[PDB]
Amino acid sequence: QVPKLNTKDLLTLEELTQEEIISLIEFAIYLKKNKQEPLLQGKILGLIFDKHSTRTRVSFEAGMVQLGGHGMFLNGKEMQMQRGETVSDTAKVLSHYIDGIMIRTFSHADVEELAKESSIPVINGLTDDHHPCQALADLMTIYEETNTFKGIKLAYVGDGNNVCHSLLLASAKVGMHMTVATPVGYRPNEEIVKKALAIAKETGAEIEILHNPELAVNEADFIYTDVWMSMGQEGEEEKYTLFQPYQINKELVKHAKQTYHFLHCLPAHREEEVTGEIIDGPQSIVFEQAGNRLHAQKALLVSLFKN
Amino acid sequence: QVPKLNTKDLLTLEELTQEEIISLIEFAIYLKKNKQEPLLQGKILGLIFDKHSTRTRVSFEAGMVQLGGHGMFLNGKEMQMQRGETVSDTAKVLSHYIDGIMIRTFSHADVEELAKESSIPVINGLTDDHHPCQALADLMTIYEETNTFKGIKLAYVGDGNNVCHSLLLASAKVGMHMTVATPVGYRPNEEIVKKALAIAKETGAEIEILHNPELAVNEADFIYTDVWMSMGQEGEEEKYTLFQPYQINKELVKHAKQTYHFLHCLPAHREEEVTGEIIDGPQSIVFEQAGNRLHAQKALLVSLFKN
Amino acid sequence: QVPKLNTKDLLTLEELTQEEIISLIEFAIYLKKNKQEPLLQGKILGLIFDKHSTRTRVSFEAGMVQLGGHGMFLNGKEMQMQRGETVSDTAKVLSHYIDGIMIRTFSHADVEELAKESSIPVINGLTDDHHPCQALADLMTIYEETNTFKGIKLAYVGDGNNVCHSLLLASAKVGMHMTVATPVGYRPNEEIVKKALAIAKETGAEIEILHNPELAVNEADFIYTDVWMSMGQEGEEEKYTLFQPYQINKELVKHAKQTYHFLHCLPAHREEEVTGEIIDGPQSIVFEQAGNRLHAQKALLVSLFKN
Ligand SMILES: CCC[C@H](N)C(=O)O
Ligand SMILES: CCC[C@H](N)C(=O)O
Ligand SMILES: CCC[C@H](N)C(=O)O
Ligand SMILES: [Cl-]
Ligand SMILES: [Cl-]
Ligand SMILES: [Cl-]
Ligand SMILES: [Cl-]
Numbered sequence: 063q064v065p066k067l068n069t070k071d072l073l074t075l076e077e078l079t080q081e082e083i084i085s086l087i088e089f090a091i092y093l094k095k096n097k098q099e100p101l102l103q104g105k106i107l108g109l110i111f112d113k114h115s116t117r118t119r120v121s122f123e124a125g126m127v128q129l130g131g132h133g134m135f136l137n138g139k140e141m142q143m144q145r146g147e148t149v150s151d152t153a154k155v156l157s158h159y160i161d162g163i164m165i166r167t168f169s170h171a172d173v174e175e176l177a178k179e180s181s182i183p184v185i186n187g188l189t190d191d192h193h194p195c196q197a198l199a200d201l202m203t204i205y206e207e208t209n210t211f212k213g214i215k216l217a218y219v220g221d222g223n224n225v226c227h228s229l230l231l232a233s234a235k236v237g238m239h240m241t242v243a244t245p246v247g248y249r250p251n252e253e254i255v256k257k258a259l260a261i262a263k264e265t266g267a268e269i270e271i272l273h274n275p276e277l278a279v280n281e282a283d284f285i286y287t288d289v290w291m292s293m294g295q296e297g298e299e300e301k302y303t304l305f306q307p308y309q310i311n312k313e314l315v316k317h318a319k320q321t322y323h324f325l326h327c328l329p330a331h332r333e334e335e336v337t338g339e340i341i342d343g344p345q346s347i348v349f350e351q352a353g354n355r356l357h358a359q360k361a362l363l364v365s366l367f368k369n
Numbered sequence: 370q371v372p373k374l375n376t377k378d379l380l381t382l383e384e385l386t387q388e389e390i391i392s393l394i395e396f397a398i399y400l401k402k403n404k405q406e407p408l409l410q411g412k413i414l415g416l417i418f419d420k421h422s423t424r425t426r427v428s429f430e431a432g433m434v435q436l437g438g439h440g441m442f443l444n445g446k447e448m449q450m451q452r453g454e455t456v457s458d459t460a461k462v463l464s465h466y467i468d469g470i471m472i473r474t475f476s477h478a479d480v481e482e483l484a485k486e487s488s489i490p491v492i493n494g495l496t497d498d499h500h501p502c503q504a505l506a507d508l509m510t511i512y513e514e515t516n517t518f519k520g521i522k523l524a525y526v527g528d529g530n531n532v533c534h535s536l537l538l539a540s541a542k543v544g545m546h547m548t549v550a551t552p553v554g555y556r557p558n559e560e561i562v563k564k565a566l567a568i569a570k571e572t573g574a575e576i577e578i579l580h581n582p583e584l585a586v587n588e589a590d591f592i593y594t595d596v597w598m599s600m601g602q603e604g605e606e607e608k609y610t611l612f613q614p615y616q617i618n619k620e621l622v623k624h625a626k627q628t629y630h631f632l633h634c635l636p637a638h639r640e641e642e643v644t645g646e647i648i649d650g651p652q653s654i655v656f657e658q659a660g661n662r663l664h665a666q667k668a669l670l671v672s673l674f675k676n
Numbered sequence: 677q678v679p680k681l682n683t684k685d686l687l688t689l690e691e692l693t694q695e696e697i698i699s700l701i702e703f704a705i706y707l708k709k710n711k712q713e714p715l716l717q718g719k720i721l722g723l724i725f726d727k728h729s730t731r732t733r734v735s736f737e738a739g740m741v742q743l744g745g746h747g748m749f750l751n752g753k754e755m756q757m758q759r760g761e762t763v764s765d766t767a768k769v770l771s772h773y774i775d776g777i778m779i780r781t782f783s784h785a786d787v788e789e790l791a792k793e794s795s796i797p798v799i800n801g802l803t804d805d806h807h808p809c810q811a812l813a814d815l816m817t818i819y820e821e822t823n824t825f826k827g828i829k830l831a832y833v834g835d836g837n838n839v840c841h842s843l844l845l846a847s848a849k850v851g852m853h854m855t856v857a858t859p860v861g862y863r864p865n866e867e868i869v870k871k872a873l874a875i876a877k878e879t880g881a882e883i884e885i886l887h888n889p890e891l892a893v894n895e896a897d898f899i900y901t902d903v904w905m906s907m908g909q910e911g912e913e914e915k916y917t918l919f920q921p922y923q924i925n926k927e928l929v930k931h932a933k934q935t936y937h938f939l940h941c942l943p944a945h946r947e948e949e950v951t952g953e954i955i956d957g958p959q960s961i962v963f964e965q966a967g968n969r970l971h972a973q974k975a976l977l978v979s980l981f982k983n
């Protein structure tokens with residue numbers, strides 16, 4: 063049974079209810095376990111990219127192909143948007159040709175406009191502000207270990223960026239406890255924190271934004287990090303210095319549960335945000351986490367294309 | 370049935386008779402209305418692009434996929450032609466691997482050479498001189514409104530460029546009246562004008578090349594424009610002032626029929642060649658026009674591949 | 677019978693026995709002659725390219741499509757390797773999504789690492805050091821003419837580059853006599869020469885590395901050359917001066933058999949490494965040679981995917 067969703071698009075996870083998120087995760091687990099069937103026969107997903115990608119690009123197109131459809135890679139440097147065509151005109155023409163769009167870009171507003179002006183589904187494959195498909199797969203990865211979100215503690219330590227934003231919203235939706243530790247000056251966006259906190263009031267989630275990483279990871283079941291300079295960001299040399307106390311290393315993780323697992327969206331820079339010892343060690347699940355991008359997105363695609 | 374064509378390639382529309390063009394339009398209209406069948410099962414169309422594209426790139430690959438075949442995007446920057454491999458050599462090797470080629474580039478002579486040296490069909494997806502697949506779709510769009518080309522008047526106002534050339538030839542082939550207005554120094558190519566006039570002698574088409582835009586649009590059924598600086602032309606900034614009197618705006622279109630429709634190949638630059646008021650207003654059909662790139666091209670592909 | 681191979685990967689041809697190479701060539705000839713069947717139904721081959729390509733890029737994707745599978749083009753400029761992601765991390769995530777990888781790049785070591793860290797097959801589609809699929813297709817092309825490798829003489833005249841290396845190892849594997857002439861300072865890698873000589877001891881191949889092109893081509897059945905400046909090279913301007921005596925032209929080829937045939941991997945630069953008179957003349961088989969990239973690689977793909 064394909065999950066029914068009351069949304070055309072997936073831009074932040076705010077669009078989904080708790081029950082819809084759980085249904086997507088269960089359907090992804092089903093698709094992971096069972097023989098491939100051509101549920102999206104003949105369907106074409108456009109894949110617009112304005113930023114680098116390995117996992118998102120390959121997993122989306124492979125997912126479509128496994129479902130009997132097609133992915134069409136559209137480098138943003140080749141589209142007439144480069145030459146000043148509006149996002150609205152783009153949306154309207156693509157709706158005549160293909161069945162959905164996944165877009166990865168800088169401006170979140172541009173993805174909102176694309177969705178608004180498109181008659182086909184639009185999926186955010188990462189913006190400066192949100193990476194929802196990553197957080198959906200991460201929820202699946204956590205659920206495969208725990209079989210529940212109740213009483214689970216996730217600690218994110220790092221920069222208050224797009225990935226942090228999506229994990230905050232994801233955790234709040236499913237009722238999972240989440241702490242964030244960032245350096246001063248690099249907190250997650252306050253409006254997104256407020257939205258997560260509001261959601262958490264209804265679900266029982268405890269969301270805390272902190273500066274002390276040792277306190278944040280205390281008794282955590284999962285520790286998550288990400289790179290210190292994201293694709294959207296301008297360099298500060300002083301940033302690297304401020305982030306040193308936020309590295310995920312042996313000294314930090316000993317404050318979490320002995321049974322904790324390490325998560326990272328990838329790509330990773332060993333000896334910056336995380337040491338080789340941690341990411342390549344026995345508590346790391348980053349490759350299975352990455353694998354689940356495929357399954358979680360196939361569930362999302364089948365549900366959105368069924369509308 | 371599938372239209373029979375007496376050409377391997379489609380470079381300018383000169384290669385087609387009136388009857389063949391009408392047959393293509395009727396077949397496109399059939400394909401637009403009827404269930405997709407895999408008429409090109411297993412066929413691979415190579416898509417060589419040396420210039421930006423949204424509509425041509427997406428519509429050709431979607432068309433192929435919808436007919437059970439494949440489109441293979443080939444950025445010109447990645448091909449060995451960028452490192453000096455000849456067009457002839459490229460033609461000969463691609464003919465061993467794939468079933469047809471669509472090419473968008475600068476030099477029309479290059480596309481002529483590709484067709485001459487290739488044993489597979491070659492389609493011009495725009496050159497500096499011709500954009501024949503656009504004009505074929507534009508004929509289809511007109512025909513859907515009028516159900517005839519007899520007594521219809523098309524007015525093109527703008528630069529004497531590739532799209533103007535293809536519309537001149539298309540109009541002449543089907544017997545439609547066409548007027549052109551361009552600024553002094555920007556007339557369509559005189560050899561192409563002569564070809565169109567020669568074709569028009571046989572078909573009853575009245576082709577008129579003018580400078581005054583108000584005279585050109587008088588009692589028109591359709592007003593068509595395009596950008597002032599084509600991809601073949603970035604240096605030429607002077608144009609922007611010269612072309613201001615050629616803008617499609619409320620003051621201009623009142624001289625056409627009250628029932629006129631506005632066409633534009635896209636991409637468009639609002640407040641340059643056309644105002645938002647016109648392109649976004651109730652007489653604009655530019656998005657249906659763009660949608661018909663898909664269907665007109667599918668008809669062409671099935672016919673060329675039938676040979 | 678699909679050939680059984682005792683290797684997961686194809687990086688240099690060293691991985692293959694003489695019997696395996698012959699079996700591959702026979703299978704390629706069969707595939708060339710016989711109707712397409714979907715032997716690789718559903719399979720996805722990633723095609724990672726850091727360098728320009730026409731033949732390799734098109735032939736590998738067409739081959740997959742013709743076998744009922746898919747080729748996914750991945751420009752190296754768009755992958756997170758560009759932003760510092762390790763080859764190992766890349767290998768581990770791709771293995772979750774797709775079924776094999778073909779990679780064209782600079783560093784042969786990177787391709788070795790990709791193969792080591794990947795659970796799926798890896799194929800070298802050219803590196804600075806080896807171009808094994810080219811030499812496999814070249815052996816097929818020779819065998820189609822001669823029906824044997826015994827008593828056949830191949831002469832390569834040019835730069836001691838990646839293609840020279842692969843021809844050396846190919847010739848030694850099948851027992852064909854091969855001579856090389858290069859300028860002073862541009863010999864093939866001495867360790868590769870040693871490996872070829874060792875293989876040749878077992879097979880009866882005579883391999884000679886020389887400076888005098890007229891001596892090298894004496895009584896040759898085949899003459900082969902390639903460009904003087906490969907994609908990986910930023911060689912001195914003095915190089916062109918040293919290469920003047922090494923052009924393949926009428927004066928040189930008269931020293932070979934009257935029945936010789938000319939080979940070139942392509943792309944070629946007429947009037948540099950070879951004259952138009954030779955490459956377009958009656959002894960040239962370069963376009964059949966390029967065509968055989970398709971068939972030889974389809975044989976390899978099927979065999980690797982089976983294993
Ligand atoms: C997947 C990349 C995530 C990272 N925060 C970035 O935006 O660069
Ligand atoms: C579809 C683009 C048409 C325009 N005349 C150009 O050549 O840029
Ligand atoms: C197929 C190209 C071969 C040439 N030696 C190069 O590496 O550029
Ligand atoms: Cl960012
Ligand atoms: Cl893992
Ligand atoms: Cl419209
Ligand atoms: Cl090189």
Ligand SMILES: [Cl-]
Nearest residue numbers: 961962963964
């Ligand atoms: Cl040939």
